[PDB]
């Protein structure tokens, strides 16, 4: 008939990982962001439970796009009000909130799920390098 299968449930163990954007690009780090937050690279996956882990990205304010995308590609952010469009480009979010850049990038590429919106907070982004979450005794590894 059928082969019974079981999975780990309500015993998930998650860790803290360090990664830096010194010479990265948006897409090639955002793909790893989605991979880690989904936990699809580890065999501990369970769609009924959480699978990703904590992540810290530090100094997002030096990531660089290839080509003129920083000046010609635009993001519109419309509030519920009429004519609430905030127009941003690639070049301006470097001298402005780059945290929302990785934020909306990572949320756009995951399915609309109550866990995914709960997933997105497990990653922390600051343009600086100092944060009180540095006391987590975290496992450090590049390209994470």
């Amino acid at each position: 008939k059928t082969s019974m299968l079981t999975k780990e449930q309500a015993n998930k163990r998650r860790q803290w990982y360090i990664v830096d954007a010194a010479g990265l690009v948006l897409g090639k780090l955002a793909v790893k962001a989605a991979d880690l937050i989904r936990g699809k690279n580890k065999v501990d996956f369970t769609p009924n439970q959480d699978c990703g882990d904590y992540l810290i990205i530090i100094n997002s304010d030096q990531v660089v796009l290839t080509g003129n995308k920083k000046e010609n590609e635009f993001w519109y952010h419309h509030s519920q009000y009429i004519g609430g469009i905030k127009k941003v480009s690639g070049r301006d979010m470097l001298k402005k909130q780059s945290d929302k850049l990785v934020y909306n990038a990572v949320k756009g590429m995951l399915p609309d799920n109550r866990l995914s919106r709960r997933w997105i907070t497990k990653v922390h982004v600051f343009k600086g390098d100092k944060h009180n979450m540095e006391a987590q005794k975290p496992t450090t590894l590049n390209w994470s």
Binding site: S3, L5, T6, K40, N41, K42, V43, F45, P47
Partner: protein
């Protein structure tokens, strides 16, 4: 010769009404809506009998390729390692059943070159 025929009517409605229960709201309260929900759920289960394996095979391949990318090798060569050379009858789900037992799947994924 009059026959009311409301008794077997009561029985048939009752026997339609047991299975329609546990629903949110008055869905399982009246004859018509309860039967509509039962038929719709029967269709849903009929289609889900295919959908479940359609999604579980994808879950299989993703869970396997997790470990495969952990060891670097890909699923594309994995099938070549088994089916072409050293022909076996291994199936997808037993791979992850072996993954869930530590230090055993390593042996299988290492004899691929032997």
């Amino acid at each position: 010769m009059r026959i009311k025929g409301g008794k077997q009517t009561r029985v048939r409605r009752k026997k339609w009404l047991k299975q329609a229960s546990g629903s949110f709201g008055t869905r399982h309260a009246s004859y018509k809506v309860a039967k509509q929900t039962v038929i719709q759920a029967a269709k849903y289960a009929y289609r889900d009998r295919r959908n479940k394996k359609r999604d579980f095979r994808s879950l299989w391949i993703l869970r396997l390729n997790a470990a495969l990318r952990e060891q670097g090798m890909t699923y594309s060569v994995f099938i070549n390692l088994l089916k072409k050379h050293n022909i076996e009858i291994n199936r997808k789900v037993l791979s992850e059943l072996a993954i869930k037992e530590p230090s055993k799947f390593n042996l299988i994924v290492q004899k691929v070159k032997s």
